[PDB]
Design a protein that fits this description.
2 copies of one chain form a homodimer. Chain A is mainly alpha-helical and 691 residues long. Chain A contains 28 helices and 3 strands. At the A-B interface, α1, α2, α11, α12 and α17 of A face α1, α2, α9, α10 and α15 of B. Bound molecules: ligand P5S (3 copies), 1,2-diacyl-SN-glycero-3-phosphocholine (PC1) (2 copies), 1,2-Distearoyl-sn-glycerophosphoethanolamine (3PE) (4 copies) and cholesterol hemisuccinate (4 copies). The site of one cholesterol hemisuccinate (Y01) has 14 residues of chain B, from α14, α21, α22 and α23. Chains A, B: Homodimer; via the transporter region and DEP domain. Interacts with the GATOR1 complex and prevents interaction between GATOR1 and KICSTOR; this interaction is disrupted upon cholesterol starvation.
Chain lengths: 691, 691
């Protein structure tokens, strides 16, 4: 049997990043705001997590633990900590160097294994190597006890430099460091659990066993939901220096650390069984690809140093953990099967990725069609590329259900699948061209019909001339070799030209109430400004670049197969990655465009408060409209302006509270659009104030 | 084997009301306010509970269900609904008769089965009758869809009465009621679950299985915590008419409904097996002793009708529901064992209620001792009573570990146990006497000395005269008949006298920084205010009556044994109840006194908000200090006044965030005590405002 239950990995990830996704769409849709997520955070970080730790360490048997694994992971984490710390000490701004050295190693060493790592390890190693579930509750607290103190010492040194007074105490900063380390629920709950394990004999009392199980089982889902709740509105556009340091930190989290852990395990472990040693090394690798634990974000926000870099890094690393961990575990278990089960495995992962991406794509197309935003040219081409992605994702499903079974319709399904995939590649090219045209000249008369017929016909011509030449080889399971070298040649030439088209573009990249059209010209100006938006050129650029990433990966795959024509144990990674991306592009498209915020007594009391102690305040200054030609309401305020004023005054805690309060004010007959065209939102629109 | 695993009942309750307790002490200690509890409530009521329903019905097999059980429970609920509704229709205020008829029946028919009933049924009927776990998810949504429509129709009728118009049509009212019930997640989620059960073949897809398990396992742990969070402050002192209607409603929830369900089940069940029918009737009884689901509270707060009666009724019903479930499940299976295993069972439940009470009682005693409040007179007397209550629990614990084992020390352990128990009875008597004396002029100091010597020596004299007369019958397991009939008489005489004493008592019911030493009087008055209270004679009275309830129960038990001397299958209920109360009084004392509220950039930003837009509004309004003899600070405001002003203005939504804002603003060096003796709390203390 395989060292791990690989077939159970994808649902578990689908659970984890499923629950997180729920939380995100709960936070963005104002179902659970930022203030209201504090209660969930306190519950999961004060009651659920300490009960899980206590229950899972009291029963733990300290006499049957492979300490070599813990030593190896601790050595690897310490090495990454030291390397990052010394590198920051050498090259960084001298003003905040200590800060950049007191948080960056913590970002690159800790892991989100309690909430986002434990479900995956449980799914992988529960019916094969259950003892692997103990190390999650040992490595994380120990590494939190032997690395966090050094980082916090550095942060307290930076705070000392913030004051730079006559205080020269060297023990005070260290004491505060270990005090802030010891004031963490994880550390002292670990200590209490160990003490009670020593007191008892690994027999949790029956009186408290049910309480502990009930309060600990409700951690994983709740913790993931809270993580999703805090993971909305954090990531922001960064300076190029911030971009490159984020790249380096994320790479040091999911590239340096896993390799270091696997090397140390294959260096220290003395296990007689080769299979056990290989599985242990695989576990060491898969333990380091875990995302950055959100504890680094709260540490940064407590010290108030690099809050944006640390929070955005944790947010991005949470995304990047999923595909990396999936491909890592699959590639790690790949050299354990014959090439024929290898082909079945790659087909099955393609089918799973295809079903889930198809659901996401159908959803995103639902937003596109019911939002009527596809009329604009960029969104028209995005919808066209998205329906092409839906066609390829469904064609893969039908192909796996018809591979080598019905040769009669195999020609038809192959034609549909690869015509749609070539359409996706060429449509990435056409998207690049469309943003090129938008940047070059505005208000052009070029039809979209020519672009559409090209993007759906050149793939059709390619597949037709591919079918005409050669013969059908209805024996290979994979679709890429249904025809042979000819098919790979066509798939390489169209893929090549697609990336040249993409790269060429990329490189160069009075009144009181409602007023009449003359007296409400500012509303028309705001409507024109809004029409100037709703394009999201940066969003399209991001989609195109992330698509070009997989386009280049598949180009490298086809060139390697054509020229070398030798597997060499490296080509398996290439085929797996190309099969992953070809039908996982739906996830990317859903992530960028499939999700967006665009698409009585209590309210009376709130309106009374606002009109009692806040109507006549400095908001009167912030509410004003300039003369719209000859006449104006002179009582119109921007939604963002009122939100900012409410935040600064203190009636709201974040933007969500401000927008909900404004929604209540609107429902209370006080706030309304100057022309009633729209409804309260945190965007630049003038709103009249009535009375 | 027994029809239910009764030995696992106590831990499960201890889990459930344990988790709730955590939530309460989380809410009371301001760890999670109500606004922050809104997020947890939304999570549990929108993502966890719907996932649990969907997962538990997609796999549900409608082909094999005992429909007679559901028919019986629905008939019983409908009968209770009809009886209560017609009763409040006949006798109630005509102005709000419809309100009292549309909320009371849904208060006395629904149950907290999803969160507070499922764990108990799982603990009782998982390894014996697992099919009993389906009916929790079947009866509750059905009763929601067949009873709450009528209730909501009545509430909409009351709303029509509130705003009378010439629209006799009932179509709008019934439509609004059906829309209100249909907007509940518990309704359309079970509809979708049934639809997907029909679509599939009770095989939830592996892609969503892990997601559903992860998002549904975090409901039982989290719903109880949210219930505890929302249980803080919802109980309010009620008028005597409200008291009697609450008595009637709680009785109709845990006396009428379970009896009706059991009768209807033993009316419609055609089960051939007598054991299965008896177990089903026991399940029907144990399903109606469940507490009122908090959905009735949110319905009442949505309609804004009897919010105080419904909320307080749910709060009280949940607490009453625990001992009633314990005694009901024990008594129901009580005649399933021989009298000697009967004695072992009552001893074991005594040992369980003994250990838990000792843990909470040591906690309460520690609170009293480190509070230094035992120097007070009522508090000294109740501290002595509490020490006796701890000694009796410890003696019972030792007795169970020494019963019929070491006859040498059995005399000593028995003497300790029953001397402590007689001390508790006589100390309830002396507490009644002390509160009667406190109700008087109280110019005479209470004789602490002779009262304590009496309360701790008269039990010693009683146990000595009991030991002197008679012989040692060291064969009976129960401690009430270790000696014989003489012990019964000795217990009955002191118990009688204690209630006579208690019944008699019951029926007897300038400057800016610092004020000058010679120019400061009102600060001395507000200091006197504190020790004018801090006696909580109402709390002591409530504890006294709660104790006399069990004293009367035990008196009835001993009188029945003395006079009738016949078991009759009813005296077993008496011995179980007396053994439950003898060592359960620690729970009452802990609930009464063991828990109470008595025992930098963000703060700068809040202080900036205050020093930008809030002092001009409040200083001119909320601060006013009379001349302290000759001079005063003229800037002292009561904490309650400031909290009320903050609530009304809108800086806080309730008292919790109001006092949190006050604590922050104190830490900002603006608000402080007039003489700096005390911190910021929501009481009647004067606070200066500095600059
Ligand atoms: C049979 C069971 C009956 C249950 C009945 C109720 C029992 C409740 C026990 C716990 C209640 C605790 C409520 C305290 C309210 C405040 C919570 C609290 O202190 O914060 C949560 C803390 C950690 O916080 P932090 O992040 O370090 O905060 C800084 C802090 N302010 C400071 O001091 O800077 O962390 C904690 O306080 C964690 C508390 C949660 C406890 C969960 C795990 C332990 C369960 C209890 C163990 C029983 C098993 C014992 C075995 C046998 C023993 C005889
Ligand atoms: C060595 C441990 C072995 C035992 C095993 C269990 C392990 C427990 C986990 C370890 C933590 C122990 C918790 C004890 C309390 C420590 C207090 C603490 O850590 O401070 C944190 C808390 C609250 O946070 P805050 O922001 O400081 O709040 C203060 C104030 N309220 C404010 O507004 O800023 O500060 C407070 O203010 C807290 C006061 C609340 C106290 C209420 C406790 C009730 C316990 C009742 C349980 C008794 C047993 C019950 C039996 C069964 C009953 C159903
Ligand atoms: C492996 C799967 C990966 C999945 C990835 C993520 C997918 C997420 C799907 C669900 C998340 C939806 C987020 C919605 C955000 C808004 C919340 C929302 O609508 O309010 C909560 C609602 C119901 O509340 P209400 O009391 O009626 O509120 C009144 C409401 N405003 C109204 O319309 O008046 O209640 C809800 O919104 C309930 C939604 C929670 C869903 C949990 C149970 C269903 C899980 C999904 C089922 C899939 C199984 C299908 C099997 C295979 C089928 C092909
Ligand atoms: C928010 C509003 C949602 C409205 C949605 C529209 C109505 C509901 C959908 C239409 C009715 C149901 C159609 C499918 C039922 C029949 C097909 C079926 O189940 O076959 C089983 C088959 C079983 O597959 P199989 O039989 O091929 O299994 C073999 C698998 N291998 C090969 C790997 C061994 O497929 C499924 O399991 C169905 C797809 C499940 C996808 C689960 C993950 C997707 C993530 C999103 C889930 C839903 C989120 C909710 C919001 C999104 C909108 C949906
Ligand atoms: C919040 C701060 C709390 C600090 C507490 C003070 C420090 C911790 C306690 C002192 C050290 C440990 C002493 C006990 C260890 C040895 C005895 C032992 O447990 O033996 C097992 C024995 C086992 O009993 P047994 O072996 O007789 O079991 C047989 C049972 N029958 C007969 C029914 C079959 O006793 C216990 O289980 C002890 C009670 C455990 C808890 C039970 C529920 C109590 C409710 C509260 C739980 C705790 C909440 C946390 C806060 C409250 C304060 C505690
Ligand atoms: C990724 C794929 C492959 C790419 C290959 C090519 C990329 C380069 C590879 C080597 C990089 C080593 C580090 C070199 C850093 C170069 C400087 C830099 O990126 O910017 C430093 C940044 C400048 O900021 P500045 O614009 O001055 O800001 C002013 C306003 N505050 O100032 C800072 O913010 C300073 C903080 C920098 C912290 C760097 C930590 C790096 C840790 C991981 C590196 C690898 C470690 C392991 C190596 C292998 C094992 C031995
Ligand atoms: C060379 C060795 C390869 C080893 C492979 C495995 C290890 C890879 C290690 C991770 C590499 C670092 C990735 C970190 C990307 C950081 C990007 C970033 O900071 O950009 C933020 C951006 C969001 O931008 P924002 O402005 O918020 O969006 C506005 C919306 N219109 O958001 C983004 O731009 C998100 C970018 C991340 C998207 C996923 C990238 C995954 C990378 C690995 C995939 C698998 C391996 C690919 C190998 C290709 C081979 C040809
Ligand atoms: C087996 C037969 C019984 C079956 C189930 C019960 C049905 C019949 C009894 C129904 C009614 C029981 C509860 C009555 C609650 C009435 C409300 C009440 O007492 O609340 C007021 C009290 C104090 O409120 P507070 O605001 O603090 O007042 C300040 C004083 N100035 O607030 C409180 O302290 C809350 C109320 C405490 C309730 C104590 C326990 C219940 C009363 C005993 C009778 C029912 C249980 C019998 C068996 C117990 C053991 C199994
Ligand atoms: C419990 C232990 C034993 C107790 C023995 C003594 C009582 C025996 C039972 C008596 C029942 C009488 C029911 C009618 C209520 C009597 C009057 C009352 O308590 O107050 C009704 C209250 C009026 O309040 P008022 O003082 O006027 O308020 C002033 C400000 N508006 O107005 C209201 O708020 C009306 C609310 C009526 C709700 C009645 C619910 C009854 C449900 C259970 C009854 C039995 C049902 C099952 C019986 C067996 C099956 C048929
Ligand atoms: C193996 C790989 C190819 C797929 C398996 C993991 C998926 C289930 C993951 C990968 C990418 C994830 C998505 C990446 C990006 C986001 C945006 C994220 O929200 C934000 O970061 C934006 C919040 C805001 O609007 O401020 C919410 C989750 C979501 C949809 C993720 C949902 C889960 C996804 C699809
Ligand atoms: C193997 C393939 C399938 C890659 C798997 C990962 C992607 C599906 C993820 C990883 C990074 C994600 C992106 C990271 C950042 C953002 C920005 C985010 O928008 C913001 O600027 C956040 C704030 C806001 O939306 O208000 C929207 C999601 C998006 C495009 C994410 C879309 C989904 C991405 C590409
Ligand atoms: C069957 C018997 C032996 C035990 C039944 C279960 C116990 C574990 C229950 C019985 C009474 C319960 C207590 C009754 C009263 C309260 C007060 C309650 O808080 C409030 O209602 C007031 C909150 C506020 O001050 O605002 C918090 C739970 C608690 C301690 C309860 C915790 C759980 C207890 C001890
Ligand atoms: C089988 C034996 C152990 C009896 C089990 C029942 C008692 C232990 C429970 C049942 C109801 C409980 C009461 C329910 C509600 C309250 C009000 C609660 O708070 C108040 O006094 C109201 C104001 C507030 O604190 O919010 C204090 C605990 C108390 C008296 C509880 C004390 C413990 C009681 C009596």
């Amino acid at each position: 049997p395989p060292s791990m239950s690989i077939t159970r990995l994808f649902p578990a990830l689908l659970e984890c990043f499923g629950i997180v996704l729920c939380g995100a769409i709960a936070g963005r849709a104002n179902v659970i705001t930022s203030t209201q997520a504090k209660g969930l955070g306190n519950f999961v970080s004060r009651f659920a997590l300490p009960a899980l730790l206590f229950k899972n360490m009291v029963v733990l048997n300290f006499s049957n633990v492979d300490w070599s694994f813990l030593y190896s992971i601790l050595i690897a984490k310490a090495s990454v900590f030291f390397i990052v710390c010394v590198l920051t000490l050498l090259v960084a701004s001298p003003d905040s160097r200590f800060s950049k050295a007191g948080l960056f190693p913590i970002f690159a060493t800790q892991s989100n294994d309690f909430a986002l790592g434990y479900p995956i390890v449980e799914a992988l190693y529960q019916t094969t190597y259950p003892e692997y579930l103990q190390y999650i509750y040992l490595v994380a607290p120990i590494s939190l006890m032997m690395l966090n103190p050094i980082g916090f010492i550095f942060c307290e040194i930076q705070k000392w430099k913030d004051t730079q007074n006559a205080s020269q105490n060297k023990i005070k900063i260290v004491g505060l460091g270990l005090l802030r380390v010891l004031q963490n629920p994880i550390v002292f709950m670990v200590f209490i659990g160990i003490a009670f394990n020593f007191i008892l004999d690994r027999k949790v009392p029956v009186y408290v066993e049910n309480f502990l199980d009930g309060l600990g089982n409700s951690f994983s889902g709740s913790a993931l939901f809270y993580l999703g709740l805090t993971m909305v509105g954090k990531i922001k556009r960064l300076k190029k220096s911030a971009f490159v340091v984020l790249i380096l930190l994320i790479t040091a989290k999911l590239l340096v650390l896993p390799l270091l852990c696997r090397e140390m395990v294959e260096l220290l472990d003395k296990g007689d069984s080769v299979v056990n040693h290989t599985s242990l090394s695989n576990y060491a690798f898969l333990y380091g690809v875990f995302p950055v634990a959100p504890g680094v974000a709260i540490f940064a926000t407590q010290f108030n140093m690099e809050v944006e870099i640390i929070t955005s890094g944790m947010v991005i690393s949470t995304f990047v953990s999923a595909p990396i961990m999936y491909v890592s575990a699959w590639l790690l278990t790949f050299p354990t099967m014959d090439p024929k089960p290898l082909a079945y495995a790659i087909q099955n992962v393609s089918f799973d990725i295809s079903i889930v991406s198809l659901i996401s794509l159908i959803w995103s197309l639902a937003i596109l069609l019911l939002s009527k935003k596809y009329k604009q040219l960029p969104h028209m081409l995005t919808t066209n590329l998205l329906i092409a992605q839906s066609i390829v994702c469904a064609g893969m499903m039908i192909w796996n259900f018809v591979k080598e079974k019905n040769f009669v319709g195999q020609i038809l399904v192959f034609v549909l699948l690869y015509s749609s995939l070539y359409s996706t590649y060429l449509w990435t090219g056409l998207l690049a061209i469309s943003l090129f045209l938008l940047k070059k000249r505005e208000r052009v008369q070029i039809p979209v019909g020519i672009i559409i017929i090209s993007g759906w016909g050149i793939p059709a011509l390619l597949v037709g001339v591919l079918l005409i030449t050669g013969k059908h080889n209805g024996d290979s399971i994979d679709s890429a070799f249904f025809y042979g070298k000819e098919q790979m040649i066509t798939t390489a030439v169209t893929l090549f030209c697609s990336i040249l088209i993409a790269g060429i573009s990329l490189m160069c990249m009075h009144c009181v109430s409602r007023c009449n059209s003359q007296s409400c010209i500012l509303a028309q100006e705001e409507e024109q400004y809004l029409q100037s938006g709703d394009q999201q050129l940066t969003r399209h650029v991001l989609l195109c670049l992330l698509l070009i990433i997989g386009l280049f990966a598949n180009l490298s795959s086809c060139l390697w197969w054509l020229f070398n024509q030798e597997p060499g144990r490296l080509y398996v990674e290439l085929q797996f990655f190309c099969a992953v991306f070809n039908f996982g592009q739906g996830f990317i498209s859903f992530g960028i465009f499939g999700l967006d915020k665009h698409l009585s007594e209590e309210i009376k009391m709130t309106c009374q408060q606002f009109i009692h102690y806040h109507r006549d305040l400095c908001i009167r200054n912030i509410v004003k409209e300039r003369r719209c030609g000859a006449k104006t309401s002179a009582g119109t305020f921007c939604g963002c302006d009122l939100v900012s004023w409410l935040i600064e005054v203190g009636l709201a805690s974040d933007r969500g509270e401000a927008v909900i309060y404004g929604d209540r004010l609107v429902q209370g007959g006080v706030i309304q659009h100057i022309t009633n065209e729209y409804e309260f939102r945190d965007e630049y629109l003038f709103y009249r104030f009535l009375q």
